[PDB]
Amino acid sequence: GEELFTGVVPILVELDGDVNGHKFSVSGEGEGDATYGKLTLKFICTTGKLPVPWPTLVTTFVQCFSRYPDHMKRHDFFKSAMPEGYVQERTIFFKDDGNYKTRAEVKFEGDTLVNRIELKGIDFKEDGNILGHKLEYNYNSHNVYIMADKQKNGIKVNFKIRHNIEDGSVQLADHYQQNTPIGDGPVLLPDNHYLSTQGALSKDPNEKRDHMVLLEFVTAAGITHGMDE
């Protein structure tokens, strides 16, 4: 799966979602060059307004496109599970508010890296930060902590997203994450490490729909020795 990422790879992103029985669908479209850990993507909400704020769906909407330095290349689980792909599951708990459970298949369909999401949210407050749309429209820098999970044959992941509340405070979102092969074959199981992100949310000023533009930079780090479980 390393060999598959040398250059620019086109991506489709399809989410279908329900949050407090607000059904909705999003479609996304862009490119990844994993040589630089670069992603650029556009998302549009094909069922009207998105009822969640956009920042809360950034983590949900392809970590095969992280940049792994040559010295960490054999700790790269994500790419190593391609083309057959990987299933990615997540429960995201928002502090003093509800949660998203999500399930995604990330796999190559054709020459296009595809991420296909199903997502349920519950116990969200209507006078909320989330359903009351109270979060700034921004991407901050984060670190993504990864460990191996030999049992399941994949990785366990956790990190906290720090969403800026319009008032000013922080709205935490705690991502309990699991990734596993759809890949019936062999994937690289990493020693513990992190990824480090940069990014930006913005708007296409011509796009009439509810949407989001994501440019993102993600680099792997934390390891300096001699590699493989």
Curated annotation (Swiss-Prot):
Changing A200K: Abolishes the tendency to dimerize and leads to monomeric fluorescent proteins. Changing I165V: In EBFP1.2; shifts the excitation and emission spectra to shorter wavelengths and increases quantum yields compared to BFP. The keyword Iron-sulfur does not apply. Photocytes. Changing F43L: In mut3.3; shifts fluorescence lifetime from 3.03 to 1.88 ns. In R10-3; matures to the red-emitting state with excitation and emission maxima at 555 and 585 nm, respectively. Changing S141P: Increases fluorescence at warmer temperatures such as 37 degrees Celsius. Changing V144I: In Azurite; shifts the excitation and emission spectra to shorter wavelengths and increases quantum yields compared to BFP. Changing A200V: In EBFP1.2; shifts the excitation and emission spectra to shorter wavelengths and increases quantum yields compared to BFP. Changing N192I: In mut2.1; shifts fluorescence lifetime from 3.03 to 2.50 ns. Pfam families: GFP. This is Green fluorescent protein. It comes from Aequorea victoria (Water jellyfish).
